[PDB]
From a paper:
The space group (C2221) and the cell dimensions of the crystal were not changed significantly by soaking with THF. THF is bound at the N-terminal region inside the cavity that is present through the N- and C-terminal domains. There is little structural change in a whole protein upon THF binding. However, slight conformational changes were observed for side chains of Leu56, Lys59, and Tyr108. THF binding caused relocation of Leu56 and Tyr108 residues because steric hindrance may occur with THF at the original positions of these residues in THF-free HypX upon THF binding. Lys59 residue shifted toward the domains interface because relocation of Tyr108 caused steric hindrance between Tyr108 and Lys59. The β3-α3 loop in which Leu56 and Lys59 are located also shifted slightly upon THF binding. Because the N10 of THF forms a hydrogen bond with Asp109, the formyl group of N10-formyl-THF will lead steric hindrance with Asp109 in the present structure of THF-bound HypX. Comparing the structures between THF-free and THF-bound HypX indicates that conformational changes around the THF binding region are induced by THF binding as shown in Supplementary Fig. 5, which is an induced fit type of conformational change.
The crystallographic analyses reveal that HypX consists of the N- and C-terminal domains that are structurally homologous to the hydrolase domain of FDH and enoyl-CoA hydratase/isomerase (ECH/ECI), respectively. HypX will catalyze two consecutive reactions, the formyl-group transfer from N10-formyl-THF to CoA and decarbonylation of formyl-CoA, in the N- and C-terminal domains, respectively, to produce CO. The putative catalytic residues, His74, Asp80, and Asp109 in the N-terminal domain and Ty416 and Glu426 in the C-terminal domain, are perfectly conserved among HypX homologs listed in the previous report. CoA is constitutively bound in HypX, which will act as the prosthetic group for CO biosynthesis through the formation and the decarbonylation of formyl-CoA. CO produced by HypX is used as a ligand of the iron in the NiFe(CN)2(CO) center of NiFe hydrogenases.
Residue numbers in the entry: -1 to 562
The structure:
């Protein structure tokens, strides 16, 4: 089995990238045609002539010319019989206790085809994006692998649907948060169902907005719709029975972008008081904690729940503060855990795009990230560990590589390159860390590859030190146990004595400083040089500008010397 597989995807999104990894790392070939026009889709099928078509993420109908000619399998993020374009939204709004995913054949009627495979799972009360990125994506991977085995077997017959139902596109009126009528549980459900798109509409301080990234608040109380506090740019708003934090909003205008709530509401918030909670404090009630520091068994764990993995200048400085605190604690190891869904996606391109000078903000942001990285590297007397529970891209990957040890959950997808953001040179001391791990030649290959790689592939090529665990929680438990065993071994004290000698030597310190200087001179050129590739790419990314063709790096069937 060395199949030629065509993906049809509206966007080469997290699910499409995970499946690309699983299939190519099994030596199948995967070409991608983006969903631009049915005529383009027909052309791509005739050009590539796939053994099999998989549609991981598709907003419109595959033309009959295609799927009547090539076996076409379609991902649906609901259990068998569920039909419609907003399966997860409805599941969350209705409070389903069980959900699932289905791999079904293309047919004329939407989501009506025979079932090739499916998986079910218990629902979490959580954002739609988190369910999509965890339960749904893991379940779809098992379905596609099972279908591949069925396909190459040759005698598989799919199971036609029996019971079924249709849920239409969900209207905003259903998502709209009414602070006076909605208790906290209802506000969470609506925001969760609409996160990360299209957001739950609401009015806040008289502004029509879309709400994102909600968290319950049990201590602060007030009037429904009253802003009770600010905390790391999230706002806390009274509900019918309590209060909810909203960390991000978007104004309901065509060109607006998702930003920290404080930046969207602006002067409307004048007078609200910051209610700070340091990451290392203990509290007994539910509240919003962007960064959390906890110590167990001689290990200091730093969770940083930065929305979408995007690290603003100010979030970097808050993370830096917590790393400095941890370096002063009696721990043997410091573990950077990111969040369950992302380790890090590097600089925050939205707060950059929103600044008066995106170039100056990029410069602020890359220096802030490098300060975090430098603080990590210059930790002579403690083990540092990156635990990648979730995906990482661009600078977020190289952030992890500054730690002594990098581990990742099974199924994490890595994008250790800058080809989507205008071929940035990158920093985070990659010119020091990457050759140490894989050599200069391989490291340059890694950064020239625009396609994703899995954590398994990253481990096999030496980019990271291990991969284990299927869920974030299992990964965290295995990580703690692995680090605990190490710091309680004789090997740890020998390693630390060596690291003390290396990381306090003038030779080492001057080397890493030169690496930062060289990287930042190159990023300066990216940010400020006459060539504005970086700013153009950031604009397309942040504004989600459509494609009018599939680039040849995705479409094998559209490269220059493509034959047969
Ligand atoms: C890493 C990457 C390839 C992953 O692709 P993917 O799995 O399809 O994930 P998405 O692009 O859909 O990201 C999910 C969300 O996080 C956003 N996001 C990801 N990285 C971001 C970043 N650095 N800054 C701001 N937003 C980011 C995306 O806009 C998207 O937003 P939305 O769901 O609110 O609509 C892609 O997210 C990416 O290129 N991010 C930018 C990394 C970067 O260039 N950082 C700056 C240089 S250090
Ligand atoms: N051949 C064929 N093509 C398909 C599917 C199929 O089974 N058969 N299933 C699709 C995946 N699931 C859906 C289900 C419903 C809708 C849908 O309802 N679209 C509305 C617009 C809704 C929107 O705004 O997104 C329309 O009028 O086209 C879109 C994708 C992929 N395209």
């Amino acid at each position: 089995s060395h199949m030629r597989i065509l993906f049809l995807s509206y966007r080469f999104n997290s699910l499409s990238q995970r499946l690309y990894c699983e299939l190519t790392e099994r030596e199948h070939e995967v070409s991608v045609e983006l969903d631009v026009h049915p005529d383009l889709t027909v052309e791509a099928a005739e050009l590539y002539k796939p053994d099999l078509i998989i549609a991981p993420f598709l907003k419109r109908k595959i033309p009959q010319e295609v799927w009547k000619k090539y076996k076409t399998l379609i991902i649906h993020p609901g259990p068998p019989g569920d039909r419609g374009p907003n399966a997860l939204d409805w599941a969350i709004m209705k409070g389903e206790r069980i959900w699932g995913v289905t791999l079904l054949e293309a047919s004329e009627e939407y989501d009506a085809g025979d079932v090739w495979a499916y998986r079910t799972f218990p629902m979490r009360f959580a954002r739609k994006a988190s369910i999509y990125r965890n339960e749904v994506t893991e379940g779809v991977v098992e379905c596609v692998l099972e279908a591949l085995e069925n396909f190459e077997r040759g005698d598989f017959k799919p199971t036609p649907q029996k019971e079924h139902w249709w849920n239409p596109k969900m209207e905003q009126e259903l998502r709209r948060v009414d602070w006076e009528q909605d208790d906290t549980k209802t506000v969470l459900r609506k925001v969760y169902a609409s996160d990360s798109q299209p957001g739950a509409s609401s009015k806040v301080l008289g502004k029509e907005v879309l709400l994102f990234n909600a968290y319950p608040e049990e201590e602060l109380k007030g009037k429904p719709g009253e802003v009770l506090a600010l905390r790391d740019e999230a706002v806390c708003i009274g509900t019918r029975d309590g209060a909810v934090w909203i960390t991000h909003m978007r104004e309901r205008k065509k060109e607006s972008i998702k930003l920290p709530s404080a930046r969207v509401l602006g002067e409307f918030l004048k007078g609200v008081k910051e209610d700070p909670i340091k990451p290392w404090e203990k509290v007994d009630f539910k509240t919003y904690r962007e960064i959390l520091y906890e110590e167990e068994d001689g290990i200091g764990f730093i969770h940083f729940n930065f929305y979408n993995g995007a690290m603003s200048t100010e979030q970097c400085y808050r993370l830096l503060e917590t790393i400095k605190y941890a370096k002063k604690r009696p721990v043997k190891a410091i573990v950077l855990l990111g969040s369950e869904d992302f380790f890090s996606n590097g600089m925050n391109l939205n707060t950059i795009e929103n600044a008066e000078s995106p170039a100056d903000e990029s410069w602020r942001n890359i220096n802030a990230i490098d300060d975090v990285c430098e603080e990590i590297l210059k930790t002579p007397d403690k083990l540092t560990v990156a635990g990648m529970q979730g995906n990482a891209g661009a600078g977020g990957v190289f952030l992890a590589l500054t730690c002594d040890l990098v581990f990742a959950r099974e199924g994490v997808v890595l994008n250790p390159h800058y080809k989507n953001i205008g071929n940035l040179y990158g920093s985070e001391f990659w010119t020091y860390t990457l050759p140490k791990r894989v050599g200069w030649e391989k490291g340059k290959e890694v950064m020239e590859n625009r396609m994703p790689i899995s954590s398994k592939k990253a481990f096999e090529i030496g980019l990271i030190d291990g991969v284990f665990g299927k869920t974030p929680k299992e990964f965290r438990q295995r990580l703690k146990e692995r680090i605990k065993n190490f710091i309680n071994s004789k090997d740890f004290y020998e390693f630390i004595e060596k690291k003390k000698k290396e990381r306090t030597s003038g030779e080492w310190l001057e080397e890493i400083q030169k690496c930062r200087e060289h990287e930042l001179e190159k990023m300066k050129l990216n940010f400020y040089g006459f060539d504005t590739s970086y700013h153009i790419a950031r604009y397309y990314f942040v504004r989600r500008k459509p494609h009018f063709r599939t680039p040849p790096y995705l479409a094998i069937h559209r490269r220059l010397k493509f034959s047969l």
